[PDB]
Write a protein that binds this ligand. Sequence first.
Ligand SMILES: O=P(O)(O)O[C@H]1[C@H](OP(=O)(O)O)[C@@H](OP(=O)(O)O)[C@H](OP(=O)(O)O)[C@@H](OP(=O)(O)O)[C@H]1OP(=O)(O)O
Ligand SMILES: O=P(O)(O)O[C@H]1[C@H](OP(=O)(O)O)[C@@H](OP(=O)(O)O)[C@H](OP(=O)(O)O)[C@@H](OP(=O)(O)O)[C@H]1OP(=O)(O)O
Ligand SMILES: O=P(O)(O)O[C@H]1[C@H](OP(=O)(O)O)[C@@H](OP(=O)(O)O)[C@H](OP(=O)(O)O)[C@@H](OP(=O)(O)O)[C@H]1OP(=O)(O)O
Ligand SMILES: O=P(O)(O)O[C@H]1[C@H](OP(=O)(O)O)[C@@H](OP(=O)(O)O)[C@H](OP(=O)(O)O)[C@@H](OP(=O)(O)O)[C@H]1OP(=O)(O)O
Lengths: 271, 271, 273, 272
Amino acid sequence: DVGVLTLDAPAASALPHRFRTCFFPLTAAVPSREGLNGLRVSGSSQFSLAGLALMREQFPPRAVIVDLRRESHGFLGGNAVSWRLPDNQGNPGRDAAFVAEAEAALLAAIDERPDIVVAREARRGGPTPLTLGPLPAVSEAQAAASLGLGYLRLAVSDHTRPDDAVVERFVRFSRSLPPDVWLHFHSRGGAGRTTTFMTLVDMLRNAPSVAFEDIIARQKALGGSDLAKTPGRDALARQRLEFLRRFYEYARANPGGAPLGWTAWLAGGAK
Amino acid sequence: DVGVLTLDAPAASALPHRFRTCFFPLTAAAVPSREGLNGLRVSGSSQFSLAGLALMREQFPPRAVIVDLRRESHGFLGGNAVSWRLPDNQGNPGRDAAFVAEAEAALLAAIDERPDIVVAREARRGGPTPLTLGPLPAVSEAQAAASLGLGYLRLAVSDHTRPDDAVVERFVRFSRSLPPDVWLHFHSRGGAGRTTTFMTLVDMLRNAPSVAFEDIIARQKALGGSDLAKTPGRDALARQRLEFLRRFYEYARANPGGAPLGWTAWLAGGA
Amino acid sequence: DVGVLTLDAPAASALPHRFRTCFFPLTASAAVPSREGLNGLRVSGSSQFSLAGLALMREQFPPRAVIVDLRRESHGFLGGNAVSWRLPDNQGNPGRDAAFVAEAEAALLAAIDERPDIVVAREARRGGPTPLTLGPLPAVSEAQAAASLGLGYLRLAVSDHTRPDDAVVERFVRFSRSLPPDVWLHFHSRGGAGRTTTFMTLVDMLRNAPSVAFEDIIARQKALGGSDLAKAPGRDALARQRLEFLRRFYEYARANPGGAPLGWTAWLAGGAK
Amino acid sequence: DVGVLTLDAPAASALPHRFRTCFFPLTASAAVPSREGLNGLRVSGSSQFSLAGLALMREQFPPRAVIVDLRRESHGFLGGNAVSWRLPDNQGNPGRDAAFVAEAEAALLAAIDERPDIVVAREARRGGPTPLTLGPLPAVSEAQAAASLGLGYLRLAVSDHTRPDDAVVERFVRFSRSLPPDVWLHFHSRGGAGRTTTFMTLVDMLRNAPSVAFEDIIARQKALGGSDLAKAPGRDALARQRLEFLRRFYEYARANPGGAPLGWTAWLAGGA
Ligand SMILES: O=P(O)(O)O[C@H]1[C@H](OP(=O)(O)O)[C@@H](OP(=O)(O)O)[C@H](OP(=O)(O)O)[C@@H](OP(=O)(O)O)[C@H]1OP(=O)(O)O
Ligand SMILES: O=P(O)(O)O[C@H]1[C@H](OP(=O)(O)O)[C@@H](OP(=O)(O)O)[C@H](OP(=O)(O)O)[C@@H](OP(=O)(O)O)[C@H]1OP(=O)(O)O
Ligand SMILES: O=P(O)(O)O[C@H]1[C@H](OP(=O)(O)O)[C@@H](OP(=O)(O)O)[C@H](OP(=O)(O)O)[C@@H](OP(=O)(O)O)[C@H]1OP(=O)(O)O
Ligand SMILES: O=P(O)(O)O[C@H]1[C@H](OP(=O)(O)O)[C@@H](OP(=O)(O)O)[C@H](OP(=O)(O)O)[C@@H](OP(=O)(O)O)[C@H]1OP(=O)(O)O
């Protein structure tokens, strides 16, 4: 069971939903803004190919698309499509290396073939399905490269916090970035997963100087979701908020991911 | 048998060997035609260290892409570029980039942050005594490129060998999808056969209708590449490669820039 | 009379007031105007920035970005502080083009470069009314400030509270036509309102006038964070002259998409169609 | 006397003569000079370019690149053609700074903008001796040409065949110190030889003087494609004056790496 091939964003869509950068205005009470503008971070929902090209017009030099979707996905023509299991829990427990190979085979099987049936939710032009093809099927990694943009894949399950291995890899990644690299995160809807990692970036820089509640509140006011909003989905949201509180303390004791990493800090009892 | 872990370039290495751009001077033989060469938006080199990549980035234009042509599994252990070398460097034989990416990911994971990792060294790279390294971070080149805000494309080409038809097909489609501002930097292990082959393909896709086959081959050598016209096992592969380049030249003359027909579609029209 | 040396933005200021890009959200006043063609304009605007503010904006500027300075008045930077020479109604270098202004302000900046006891006036809104005494500090033009960051720079002398002269409109239309598809324009004036919003509107019209109503372009440039160009008799006369100009330029842009085939002066010479 | 309007580069010209970056190979004359610190200078140079030539060079320019125009003589573009106003020995705007030059050349360009029958002289090396008759064509400064491509622009008025004035050196050192680590400088003059190589050398010294010998820096800037700053009594005196200045700047850069803690003129005050 590889899931139902489903539409994420039609080829005709432009700027993806929930697009925002750390320079956007805050929509309210209003939390502290200290250290927000300088984070070199933005986020959005899943984009079409045209939407990516549009965003690139305002991307700075040396920008990176950080794909947070553990589920297999890609592009059929300009259409962003994905393979949806129940609760969108594709490739459960799999890392980005496994996911990349699995979704590559799925995309290869629909490349330049007619009569590809793509399901559509009501919010995305449904409920009637969309029949497409023959069209080129490509991964988002290649889509990003075709525009001269960096690409990093981190497998995060929908509605779920990132695994400890994903957090460790991202913190190490963040430390390695030259000062001029810009990160654009995205998930499917640009809400939970996207807002979580924009928050991690915010904490890695500002946790020593900005309150936990202000970071969570301002990432919402920027256009993200409310990570402080917390049975199945509620429990995952509670688990996520607990992780964010624990990561906040980590970032306070290890500004910018140093001197200790995430897993090393946990192994030492979070001293 | 996954091969011997071998050094490609030590962390201390700077600009990789055989680095050149389409703007470099031509070193003569008679000097070939230069029509259409400067405007190709292409460069090439041998395998680089992390420091070497960062140095090259200082002179990369906006929206630059690292095109990794190595079918063999490789990556970075610290700043050191390392690879798993089978006999004749024929790792992952017959495998595509999706298979290679996952296979090398596991290999890199097995040496990540571990002490006493023995890295073989050829005489030309400081050998025959090996290097004992660790604990050091092991990362794929995909992540190394992303950490600098650079694009990354992986195409699995066997050392000493032409690219498979499927690889050619994928690259021509990739080439057609590039906006006019995207820059491609190819590299292999030595920056000779495979690197020069693909710089030649880019040259032909733009200039085959107006520049002679022999001038393209000769000027890619004069830029700092290898001589693809120089052609028992290796000699047969070199002949196969040269014959392929002659066919692609014919394709590119009849289909400027890879249109209207693709590579495999064009092949179907043969006698 | 060269005017009073006045503070535009203190060195400690970060993101300049009224900063917005064509990707920013629209705040309605009235229904939200049409968004067709807005995101793709490759344009942003702001008020006068400090040096630190320019470096901050650069973090989000795309490659090949241009700082378009619309200030006819002489101005520059003393250290990180943005300063200018303000005549009554801020009408410095009246009727002068960018070439004249550049040389004039260059000498003014030279006279305060690395010298102590430079008295800079401050309006209440910019930390006043008490003055600011600075120095010794480096005095540089904005042209050099932009170059020091690898940013393009274009100077167009537009008077405060006033439309751009025909010669300025012609020069900008030609400039616009010459831009490769990847060049980004960031306009700024002193307050990032009238003059900045006028030129963001010109950019908007040059692309969208054939497909978007005049009122929608004016309203959405306001909703982006600019001023209301459709909103003190002498001041009102200039605003009326400006709106009349924008209506005439709209017709120009409808007949000559993107500034072609005819330029602004040629279109006017032909009797507007 | 504002000089003869002369062609620098025709519109059809592509990559300018003597184009090179600090990543280019070194051509030996003598042993190959030291390469330490050369690749990381973020610097390039060339002769005067046409508009098409600038667009071509931009294809390989990194982000945040700056065109540094070292020409004290008035010049600009008539269409795609690079043109200039040449006085005897190309000594236009003698003793004038960039602020004066920019306004003077702006008026000269305005006087030929969109006018027919503009006569542009041509030297033998540039298709002469017969002149070009052009127009109507748009006349723009190089400042605007760079801006139209999203490239930075800095003007430093240096006389042909001559070292930079102390005030120009002071301004450039201050400019260099103010650059973020990602800014790239592309110098150019008319021929990309004396003046261009001089400032590529100044950049080299500001970074590497403490660790690289004076003779290696001079020799490698030539081997990169520049001219020989160590190589007509009047011209010889200027070249000797220029080499002496380069020796003093080398000592300044050794004692003040990167232009700090002392500036150029402040350092000169400490002499005997
Ligand atoms: O893509 P959308 O139609 O906008 O749906 C989103 C998306 O969920 P899906 O992937 O199932 O579509 C969000 O998740 P991410 O892809 O950004 O990670 C999710 O966020 P949470 O998992 O945190 O709940 C969000 O839910 P919410 O609105 O509660 O933030 C939900 O939107 P809807 O609930 O409106 O469907
Ligand atoms: O990396 P190097 O030590 O510089 O060796 C290179 C490299 O071969 P290896 O990968 O085995 O090292 C070249 O291949 P690419 O990685 O660039 O594809 C190969 O080129 P060919 O495939 O055309 O043989 C070239 O050989 P040649 O000199 O014939 O160009 C060979 O150099 P050596 O013969 O000195 O080992
Ligand atoms: O700089 P500010 O303190 O923010 O004041 C601005 C600024 O006026 P000044 O240049 O005199 O400071 C605007 O002008 P620009 O520099 O952007 O061209 C002007 O716009 P107008 O010239 O069109 O009147 C605007 O006025 P408004 O908000 O009506 O657009 C006015 O703001 P205040 O009226 O609040 O002083
Ligand atoms: O443009 P070119 O025809 O190539 O001439 C150049 C140019 O002189 P002109 O400005 O008169 O043309 C050089 O000066 P720059 O513009 O680069 O500053 C000059 O260098 P010097 O000022 O050091 O004399 C150089 O002379 P040389 O090559 O001897 O260094 C000379 O080239 P030619 O000597 O071949 O005429």
